[PDB]
């Protein structure tokens, strides 16, 4: 049974057992100079930005972006599961320009990305909305260990005892890295408030100038209401054994501020006190609504 196993430490970070088992394959991954790396802590808008990028690469052509599921169009690099998937091999066999997905903390990223000076798009999301999203995802996505109760999961998240480690360190270190490498550091909340502005930021970063009409096509097809019903983007092509959408759909709510529905007032106060301590010596700023 490849599912519901305990996580395994990889260079200080809890990762899926099968990633740990094939870690040298991940470490030695060969990047290319024109790779675009989408890098996120889980549940921060990875799929959203991946679809945006594939739409940009295909000039807003919805049908071309339905050539395969998002997880094949934009391979999850480090995800290797025997008998199921191998992100490294998928990417190895993919023609340039490649769009690459990762959740790896900066210190675990394969060094080839740095050596190739790749452009990176990092997406961050407010911690409270992340942990709620991750809770329901743990329930539906069976590769994860059992999340337990909301209360138990919240404590694990605060302690960084979840897949890919602590959110706090993930966002902070990737933020610091923007001074060393070409990292467009985006916020889920900004994409909610003004998706046009954020997609324009992506286009400028990619050194692409496109017609307003194409920009509008990309905006339309990357909206939550469109993506949630799109079988090429909504993960419903996954086997039920891997992801059970009847437990919780991947495209769950797609809002900012769902944390209010999940956190008790006491949990919120405790979380905030802990958060300020972990984040006060970083210039990184978030919005929660
Ligand atoms: N087009 C879109 N607009 C807004 N949110 C989106 C989106 N596509 C996916 N999401 C949300 O992004 C989260 C998944 O992130 P990731 O792709 O990094 O795993 C989920 O959040 P919720 O669980 O809060 O709904 C999902 O609903
Ligand atoms: O099988 N799975 O659970 C998967 C496979 C590929 C992917 O990128 C994400 C999850
Ligand atoms: O475990 N999983 O199946 C996952 C985990 C993270 C992710 O972004 C996609 C799929």
Swiss-Prot record:
Query: What keywords appear on the UniProt entry?
Result: Catecholamine metabolism, Cytoplasm, Lipid metabolism, Transferase
Q: What are the annotated GO cellular component locations?
A: cytoplasm
Q: Return the EC number.
A: 2.8.2.-
According to the UniProt entry, its GO molecular function terms are: aryl sulfotransferase activity; sulfotransferase activity
Residues binding substrate, per UniProt? 76, 101-103, 137
Q: List positions binding 3'-phosphoadenylyl sulfate.
A: 43-48, 125, 133, 188, 222-227, 252-254
Signal sequence extent? none
Compartments reported by the entry: Cytoplasm
Swiss-Prot/TrEMBL induction comment: Up-regulated in liver and kidney by dexamethasone, a glucocorticoid analog.
Provide one Gene Ontology biological process annotation: sulfate assimilation
| Catalytic-site annotation from UniProt | 103 (proton acceptor)
Q: In which tissues is it expressed?
A: Detected in kidney and liver. Detected in kidney collecting duct cells.
Q: Name one Pfam family in it.
A: Sulfotransfer_1
Q: What does this protein do?
A: Sulfotransferase with broad substrate specificity that utilizes 3'-phospho-5'-adenylyl sulfate (PAPS) as sulfonate donor to catalyze the sulfate conjugation of catecholamines, such as dopamine, prostaglandins, leukotriene E4, drugs and xenobiotic compounds. Has sulfotransferase activity towards p-nitrophenol, 2-naphthylamine and minoxidil (in vitro). Sulfonation increases the water solubility of most compounds, and therefore their renal excretion, but it can also result in bioactivation to form active metabolites.
Q: Which family does it belong to?
A: Belongs to the sulfotransferase 1 family.
From the Swiss-Prot or TrEMBL record, give the protein name: Sulfotransferase 1 family member D1
Q: Which organism is it from?
A: Mus musculus (Mouse)
